[PDB]
Amino acid sequence: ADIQQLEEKVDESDVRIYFNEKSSGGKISIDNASYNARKLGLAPSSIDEKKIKELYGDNLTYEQYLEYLSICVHDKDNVEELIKMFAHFDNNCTGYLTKSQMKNILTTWGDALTDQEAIDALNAFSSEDNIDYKLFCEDILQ
């Protein structure tokens, strides 16, 4: 993570405008900071949120928000690692998991999605029930 690197990757004008959209008393909540990060095309995890919250609390100044954004960049993100995570659950090595299987994975471990969140994401990705998880991982990284 690095602030200079962040500011070459995303437009600081957007960073500022999004902060102003959500700020109260010159500070932004972690949840709204994560929303903004997502609008900027970044993907914070719960570990990122907890890092910044434990340093600065629930509401971030503009600079603290920039720091939090820098943590969200995740330049080491790698599609192969994501695919191999799903491949682990692919008991028959078919390249497919059903929507129900995917839902169970996504709602049971890690930074669990709600049932509705997982269902909606899977239906948004595919009309068909069998999900090619390689294609799914490639899609979410974009």
Partner: peptide, 18 residues
């Protein structure tokens, strides 16, 4: 099994949702 990678998957899903 591969928890950090699952967390990255979930993070990108939340990003896509927004």
């Amino acid at each position: 099994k591969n928890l950090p990678s699952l967390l990255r998957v979930q993070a990108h899903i939340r990003k896509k949702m927004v």
